[PDB]
Each structure stands twice: as C-alpha cells, then as structure tokens.
Symmetry: none
Subunit: 174 residues, 4 copies
C-alpha cells in the first residue's frame, strides 16, 4: 500500500455535528502537521520520490496547496450556485511545472496555513442546510455534498502527509 497508506475516503449520508466540528479542527491543524514532516528535509530529501515512479515530497507539498485552493473555490461555488459543475484540473501536469519541481516548500506551507485558516472560518459559518449543498464533478459525473467534501479533504490531507512520513521513516530521516 505505497500509494494509499490510509486507504480511501468513504462517503456517507449521515454526518453528525460533532463529526463535522472535529473534521474542521483536524483540517485547521493539517498545515502544521505537514510542516512537521517536511521541515526536517534537505533539498535532496525533498526531491526524493515518495514511492517508485511517484511524486517527490516537494511536489506533494505544492500539490496540497494547489488541490486545496481548488477545493476552497469549489466550496464557494457550491454555496453560491445550485449544484455547480466544477472545473477539473490536470494534477499531473500541474506537478510537472518547473515551479512545482523546484520551489522551496516554505511558501506553500505558509499558504496552506493561511488557506486552511480561511477555509475553516468559512466552514464554521455554514448552516446544516448549506452543508447539504453539493457540486458535480464533470469527469466522474458524481455529486458530492459539502459535508462529504470536508471528510474527503481531511482524508486527502492525511493521505499525502502519510506518503511523506512513511518515506521519512523508511529512509531513517527524522
């Protein structure tokens, strides 16, 4: 399970207030946890693939920032339009841009901290009804509610963090 260290996100129809509130807290804490994992690494460690054939740690960090900026936008689209079709992006192509392969993680780590700050602030304003609003992914044709999207991105965060910490543990880094 190199590609999926903590499995995949399982959607449900029934998500409690306590569960939503906990996921919001977990989401706010993601950037610190990511920073803890990555700040110990030198450039050659950052440029080490997390698995054979896969992205480097540096790429994963920049991907989290790009993915989560897209997600935040999708939340605001969903709150302001009725089940909007969202705009997919080619995450593989984004990760192959020169910047994604060479930029220091610090800027993306700082962006993520502030982004998850604003995102969790938005989430704390939402009513139960607003959490039941959704959006449509054009490629996969599936509709996801905002409460499930919150669960999904808690998963996505920790999925990628686990790629990094697993690599770090396997290589004997800190």
């Amino acid at each position: 399970n190199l590609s999926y260290p903590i499995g995949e996100y399982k959607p449900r129809e029934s998500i409690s207030k306590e569960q939503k509130d906990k996921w919001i807290q977990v989401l706010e804490e993601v950037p610190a946890k990511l920073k803890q994992a990555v700040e110990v690494m030198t450039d050659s460690q950052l440029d080490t693939p997390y698995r054979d054939g896969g992205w480097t740690v540096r790429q994963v960090v920049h991907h989290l920032a790009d993915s989560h900026m897209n997600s935040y936008i999708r939340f605001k689209l969903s709150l302001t339009e009725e089940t909007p079709a969202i705009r997919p992006y080619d995450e593989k192509a984004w990760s192959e841009l020169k910047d994604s392969k060479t930029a220091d993680p610090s800027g993306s780590l700082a962006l993520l901290q502030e982004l998850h700050g604003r995102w969790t602030a938005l989430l704390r304003t939402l009513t139960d009804q607003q959490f039941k609003r959704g959006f449509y992914h054009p490629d996969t044709k599936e509709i996801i509610t905002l409460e499930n999207a919150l669960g999904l991105y808690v998963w996505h965060s920790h999925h990628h963090i686990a790629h990094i910490t697993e690599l770090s543990r396997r290589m004997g880094w800190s």
Copy 2:
C-alpha cells in the same frame, strides 16, 4: 485610474515591473486597512457598494481564482476558465464579517507563490492564453498579469480614497 489596455506585445522589462508590483500588493493593502476599526471596515467605499472588508476578502478570492487560471493556461491548450459570481461570494456571511487579518496573510503568501510561478515563465509561456466564456476573449497571460496589477491598484485606491475623504488615520 483608467481601465487596463490589452497589448499585442509586452516587453520583458514591463513584465518584470508588473511582477514586482504584484509582489508588493499585499503589503500595500495591509498598510491601507490594518489600523481600521470594525466601523471603518464595514463602511461602503461608495453608496451602493462593497465595504472595505468585502474588498479585502474579494481580492483574496479573485486572486486565488486568477492563480488557478494561470496554472490551467500553462497545462492545457487555451482552456475555458470557470467564472464565479463575485457578488454572491461577497454576500456570504464570512465575507461580511471575517477579520481582514486572515485574508491579508493569505494574499501575502498567494502573491508569493504567484510571483514565483511568474518568474519561471518563458516569453512563450506568457503568450499562452485562456478563454473567458463571458467576454468571449482569449486573454494572454502577459495581459492577465497587467489586468491583475490594475485590479489590485483599482481596489486599493478605492480604500485609500475612502480614508482620505473621511479623514481616517
């Protein structure tokens, strides 16, 4: 002060000036709003218009969308971008009440990554474009850079003009 004028060609020198201006935008916005009380933040810059607070959150939202559009344009062949309802976004409770500090900090880091991206681009990458399905126009990335410099200055001016007229300090 004036609407942006699209150009067929933009010099390397002008691009570099605009990247630097874009890098400085968040510090200029912070200087314009950081001493403001809630009363001042929730004052409309004009009669039927958005408050200073709504403008700050809008810049963060607008510019995040723009950064995404840049990356779509660099990875797809003349992509159609995804418009958003900017008025509806500004009417969300969070837009009307959140403290500016978070959006100011986000804008700082966002412009940091955006200008980093811009400094990696070749001249030919700056000639890549995207299609805005509302205006029907193919906009090149070098012109979009110009547009977002104007966007920044236009909104910051609205804020500083309000403070000047009201005698705030």
Copy 3:
C-alpha cells in the same frame, strides 16, 4: 553522500516544539541499547572491519560515539552556565587513531554511553524552554547552535553512526 551519510544530515530549525523535544529526549535515552544490539553479535574480525572503504572500523565508531557524546554533554553544561560560550573543538580523526580506540573492547564504551545518555537525558528533562534556547559557539566553523538543535543533532549523530554499523552488517550478510 550515501556510504558516508546513509540517513542524510541533520537540518537545524528556527523552532523546535515541546512535543519534539520530549520525543528526542526519549530517543536519546534509548540510543545506547540500539547501538549495543548491533554490535553485541559481532566477532573481533567484524569489529575491526571498516564501515566503508577508507572509513573507521566498527570498533572505532563505537569509541567515537562515546568520545563525541561526552564532549557534547560538556558543551551542554557550558552553555547552561556561561553566556554563549565558545566550546573546545577536538580532532576526532586523531582521537580515533589512538591505540586504545583501535583495540579496546566495545563493552566499556557501550556501558559508558548507556550511563552518559542517562545523565544527559536527566539534565535535559530539568531544562526550561528558555534554557533550551541558550546557545554555544564553534570557534572554527563560526556556527552558533541552540541546545534544542544540538539535541536534534545528537539524536541524528546516534542514528547516523548506528546506520554505519547496521548498513555494514547488511552489505556483508552477517548474522
């Protein structure tokens, strides 16, 4: 790059958390048992095998850890009782070439490391956050390092030289 630096190098940080410090104190306390694990099973011929071509023997690495870490413990106490003291460099290559370093049984050094790490971690657990931010100065490299980063550095140093030994056993197919 890999034979010499099997787990990379230590990267200092501007800030170290209470939780990280506590973990590192625990790891440092247990380091000697891990070293002993690796060296306990080895014959004299194995002890006198270089960890890489042109490198120290396993025996020398063990005695080096004891010498290095004694030096470090002293540097911590200097740092706590003086204001950013300049510490005393030592010639690690020359220390490892002493007859004693090339021939002494590892047992004494292993036992010394166990007790030293015991006293060192006891010291560390008494320290306030402010004391952990105190630093010392290396007169040759011109570097200033804080005690919390020196802690991270010596956890690394332990793992680094243990890896020298375990990587050797693996490459050699020993048991």
Copy 4:
C-alpha cells in the same frame, strides 16, 4: 582540615613507573570507594553539606562525574595535540544546576565506574613519552604533564571521597 582532609596535590618533576602503576590501580578502584562512601545514605544525608559553606554530598558525587569527564577529555586532547590549551569550566555554576542538586547519585556512580574503566584502559596503553606530554590552563599558564594529571586526579578522587567519609564520621552515621 575540613576543606582539605588529605592536603593538596604536590606535583613532582618525575614519577616512577611504580608510582604510575599504583595510581592507575587507585583510579580503577575510585568508583567503588565512592559508592561505598554513599552506599546507605538517605536523601536527607545526601543533601547535607560536607562543611558549613559547602556542597552537599549529592553535589560532590555529581561533581566527580563532571570533573572526571572533563579530565578524560583533557587527556585525549593532550595525546592528539601539541601542548593544548584546555577549556576551563565553572565548577560552582555546574554544581548549582537543578540536576546537580537533585539527581539520585546512582547514575553518576555508574557513569564514574564506566568512565574510570575507559580512562585506566587509556592509561595502560600510554608510553613513557606520552605520559610526559602535557596541557596548559590558559590562565595559570602552567603546563601539567599527564603523569602529574594522573596524580592530581587520584588526589581529587580521594579528596572528595574524604569530604564524604569525614562528614559521616563527624555526624553519627558511620
């Protein structure tokens, strides 16, 4: 007297092989003698000053560990550098650290046992010429040879052990 129960160390110009060998044996035995001096002691006994203005028995134990670690390092500097300047430390300040005032003697007694084992091992490897190598205090600018340093640390050992045994005798303890 009370401060100097066995007087002070008097350096000599030369030291016989016989004296050097006797001193190496004494040094090997010091940790056991120290252990015996504090063997039964309660915490209140350990926290008794050895004389009115003085360190507690506990502080004396931890001081011996610290002093002798510093001395061992000074031997190795002397063997590997040409008459090195050594690095003084503030004995009083080290002894005032919370750890020095409170830690159980056990760990320092065990450290001393292992340290003296490595130290006497080193000493048994030395040639006569290596024993004539020295080091200087940057302040006293006195050169001390390793054979005299051996005599000095034999003295130091029994000086501080006497502080303890004399205390026990003066009090009712032993």
